[PDB]
Amino acid sequence: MLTGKQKRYLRSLAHNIDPIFQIGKGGINENMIKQIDDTLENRELIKVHVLQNNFDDKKELAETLSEATRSELVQVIGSMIVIYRESKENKEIELP
């Protein structure tokens, strides 16, 4: 759904925002996504805080988080993941 140019614009949008769903250190747990699911299903931009600790590993989690969140990782900030879930509610979202 998201494309290169959309990631840059949106990647900054979720950068100054705070994560409301947090993944444990084990990796990505559905219980955590159960909340992220409703959390992101309501908003358009979701910045998640994952405790994978590893940097290249946190990205792999997006492979599972993005594919499960039906969204697209605009970027990953340390222990935070920046993703954009498809559009449903006309929120002031950009995506050229």
CA 59 – CA 96 distance, rounded (Å):
24
CA 69 – CA 75 distance, rounded (Å):
14
Residue 84 β-bridge partners: 45, 72
Residue of 72, 90, 69, 88 whose CA lies nearest to 14: 72
Architecture label for domain 1-96? 2-Layer Sandwich (3.30)
Beta carbons within 10 angstroms of residue 93's beta carbon: 16
